[PDB]
Design a protein around this ligand. Structure first.
Ligand code: HEM
Ligand code: HEM
Ligand SMILES: *Cc1c(COP(=O)(O)O)cnc(C)c1O
Ligand SMILES: *Cc1c(COP(=O)(O)O)cnc(C)c1O
Lengths: 490, 491
């Protein structure tokens, strides 16, 4: 017992077949009630938002639209296929109450399934590649799903693959089923019945082009089939990452790299649910395009979305160049920034992985300069063992507003006149009390030879930044940096 | 400098006609098929029923949740940020290209940075250093400049986020502080929109509403309109231990000053907070909050923040008096996104001591056992520099499925028979090619004296877990093996 995820499709559908000839149970989109019975009803009806800036930055004549799927309950487009697959299984009588659900996944399907299982009371085991983000793990574990990892770069054939291991676990566990998002008709059917109807209804039937990145392929297949039926003039454009085999012709697929950073799209095999015949043209994207463009979606359009979305738009600005005014282009945005918090959203990760060259220029004049250009003054020291009011006496008598608290030489912190006074007036501290009650413990250290941009970073975390010997030579805050930049401004 | 705690000059009192109001009120509008921009995605948040947690705690009544984490920025603050901007723009106070500086818990900061991103305003955000870094990352990605202020810095002191905000405002031309603490737009947002949604969704029938308290705009704005159109509804506020907002003052007497839950509570009474429309107050703590937020997640499938957890934690107490046919609506402010590495993280919960290791009790029988109890066997080792087909030969010859690739004796990784064969059959590698092409580089090491449950954790990150001594490998374990053992011990 193992079923091939790459096994060729037995589906007899082809363009022009009546909705009557279909053997499948179709679900019509329904109105949402005033009060939702459970969170699973919050899946679907995702908004179609206009891309106002990015489209014109690249000179698109057409209308650039984005179907934002990260507004689903689990926060990904996978929440759709997870509910549907479950619901249908329940109708088959295959999925029984208290039963175990096992799935191989990029993790979005895993999160949608763990969510639905949490609500409906199913045990859920998720098998995902080791590449996938820990944020996904935190969300899954929080939903109460059991988690197994498989090595990325492990062939889909090998016993170590996520699909293979999923099956090996299914065989060893009683009442355990694999819904199999790669072979399940529910995956593309979810999109055929719901997502496509939504895209059409929202656009009033008028649609020139659709751009979608490709995972298992249920999204692009499901959408494209119904689009080819109800809006045949629409060009279907698929997006495949460099290193995958999904794109046509095979020539586009020839590549050096095997594994890549972008999560959720591309595979080393051709999924059953994937119908490559309805994709009019394919495009290859890379990790850099994806992360640059995703960050661009966030900063420009204010859409908090994942990397695959970035690939999708990155290709969209190219593929939609042919189009001209009055025509519209729809883009699929699969998931949210939540999964990627410590990866592409993090600057340090972008650097460490070499996507952001430090060269890539946009920063102001003051960015490169020494802190020494600021004009500081060495503040008075003090012991942690001093008493509050006494420090007031020293501060006013020396005419200082703040002192760094240094140890019998470990810098312990900072105490300021204003917070001392404020703390006393509220009765929060006594003049006989230890200074450690009101002390500011958190600060960061800098060299006089450090750059102003470094300081700009440090001040995004801490309020105080002390310039110190390689002995405090000065205390710097954002306000000082402002006083400098603005003084040098006029 | 204007005080955020200055008492309200508002002449509103219950029973005043809406005609007497000096304010411009904005009615909720129908969303078009295509949204002009994402800011139109703020509001119309779903009302979801709480099916499990309410009954577990024995509520006879209907427990409803207003999920505010579905807003564009992902918090209830996205509402006050748009509103505060729009009114300012209508005032002519806010001009294009101007700078907006705001003190915030960071959700207001995110809604404002988002709105600034769409409408093209420079955005400077001032937040306490306590607040989560996820917020910093989202803000920075949105193109906002970030300034931090020491937590425990009194709201009066110049080092406070409000004070620093003002000092920034004074030194920068064309810079405005929209001031969520004094701005009428904040509670008006909730009066006009949030409360209308709550009413329409509940069909005017509402017995109780529970809401946590930040600046106080949510509860104030909701409560005013609720007292007007649904007088039977009780307003219940939630304040964290260490805050001064709750009434009477007796509730506020406490040891601690600062707390872990983000977004709620303050050391001052904001102008926008109307404490007269709050029928009763409740004090909450961090443990209650995180326990209940995690509970919302695991039970209800609502991915929400800590304040939501506080709100529900109080809700299960305050709503006991209610009985069947009555409903209680709860405000769930924001999402798990800001808290990814904090309360959602088990290690952080342990490190801060919210998850006692006692509450090991819920875990199965095999959980406390030694890993060595699995019955392993030290596998054959190979060089990283060995050749593919050779490894195939040794592997078949000894009947091993895999060999750890380890001279210095540091384990470099893992090689398996099936993946090699598959790799060759696909033509990705030659029989003469080196093992490094197909090697699995990522693995983790465990001790024989570690628990099986620890291993269960390890297997959530990695596929291979090698049992080694302090670098001699005595065995290789995957999740499948742990399963084989437990299930063997089951028959
Ligand atoms: C025009 C109506 C359609 C007809 C008449 C049709 C017919 C069929 C039949 C009879 C099968 C079962 C094959 C077998 O086991 O022998 C099948 C398979 C399948 N269909 Fe359809 N189908 C239709 C539409 C669709 C659409 C629109 C989609 C996608 C949204 C879809 C998705 C699938 C999938 C994923 C399978 C997997 C079968 C396998 O395991 O090979 N079908 N189709
Ligand atoms: C008939 C109803 C109301 C009347 C007659 C009224 C009247 C007023 C007036 C005259 C002010 C003075 C503005 C100023 O001093 O700058 C004010 C302030 C204010 N009002 Fe109202 N108001 C009404 C309802 C509301 C409602 C329903 C809310 C909230 C949902 C609200 C929130 C505020 C806030 C936050 C202020 C700021 C006051 C300050 O600067 O301290 N008002 N109101
Ligand atoms: C699954 C997924 C996709 C691909 O969608 P398919 O319908 O599989 O083509 C894209 N992005 C993310 C993040 C996904 O989880
Ligand atoms: C602002 C905020 C609140 C408090 O809402 P108010 O309207 O200020 O009472 C609660 N939780 C979070 C996360 C917040 O950002």
């Amino acid at each position: 017992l193992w079923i091939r995820p790459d096994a060729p499709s037995r589906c007899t559908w082809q363009l022009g077949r009546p909705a009557s000839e279909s053997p499948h149970h179709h679900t019509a989109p329904a109105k949402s009630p005033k009060i939702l019975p459970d969170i699973l009803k919050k899946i679907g009806d995702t908004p179609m938002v206009r891309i106002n800036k990015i489209g014109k930055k690249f000179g698109l004549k057409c209308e650039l639209l984005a179907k934002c799927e990260f507004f689903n309950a689990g926060g990904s487009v996978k929440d759709r296929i997870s509910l549907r697959m479950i619901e249908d299984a329940e109708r088959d009588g295959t999925l029984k109450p208290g039963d175990t659900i096992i799935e191989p996944t990029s993790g979005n399907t895993g999160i949608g399934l763990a969510l639905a299982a949490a609500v409906r009371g199913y045990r859920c085991i998720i098998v995902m590649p080791e590449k996938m983000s820990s944020e996904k793990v935190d969300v899954l574990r929080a939903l109460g799903a059991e988690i197994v990892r498989t090595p990325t770069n492990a062939r889909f054939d090998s016993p170590e693959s996520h699909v293979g291991v999923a099956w090996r676990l299914k065989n060893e566990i009683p009442n355990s089923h694999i819904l199999d998002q790669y072979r399940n008709a529910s995956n593309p059917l979810a999109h055929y019945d719901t997502t496509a109807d939504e895209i059409l209804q929202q656009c009033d039937g008028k649609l020139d082009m659709l751009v979608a990145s490709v995972g298992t392929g249920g999204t692009i297949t499901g959408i494209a089939r119904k689009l080819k039926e109800k809006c045949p003039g629409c060009r279907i454009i698929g997006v495949d990452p460099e290193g995958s085999i999904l794109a046509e012709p095979e020539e586009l697929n020839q590549t050096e790299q095997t594994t890549y950073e972008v999560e959720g799209i591309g595979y080393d095999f051709i999924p059953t649910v994937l119908d490559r015949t309805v994709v009019d043209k394919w495009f290859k994207s890379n990790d850099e395009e994806a992360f640059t463009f995703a960050r661009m979606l966030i900063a420009q359009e204010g859409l908090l979305c994942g990397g695959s979305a970035g690939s999708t738009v990155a290709v969209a600005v190219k593929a939609a160049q042919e189009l001209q005014e009055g025509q519209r282009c729809v883009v699929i945005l699969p998931d949210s920034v939540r999964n990627y918090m410590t990866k592409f959203l993090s600057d340090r990760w972008m650097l460490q992985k070499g996507f952001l060259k430090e060269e890539d220029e946009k920063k102001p004049w003051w960015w490169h300069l020494r802190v020494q250009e600021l004009g500081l003054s060495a503040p008075l020291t003090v012991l942690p063992t001093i008493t509050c009011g006494h420090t007031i006496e020293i501060l006013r008598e020396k005419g200082f507003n703040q002192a760094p608290v240094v140890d019998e030489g470990v810098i312990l912190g900072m105490v300021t006149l204003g917070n001392m006074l404020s703390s006393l007036l509220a009765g929060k501290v006594q003049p006989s009390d230890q200074v450690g009650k009101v002390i500011y413990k958190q600060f960061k250290q800098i060299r006089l030879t450090d750059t102003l941009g470094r300081l700009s970073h440090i001040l995004e975390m801490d309020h105080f930044a002390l310039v110190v010997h390689e002995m405090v030579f000065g205390v710097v805050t954002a306000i000082d940096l402002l006083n400098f930049v603005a003084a040098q401004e006029r």
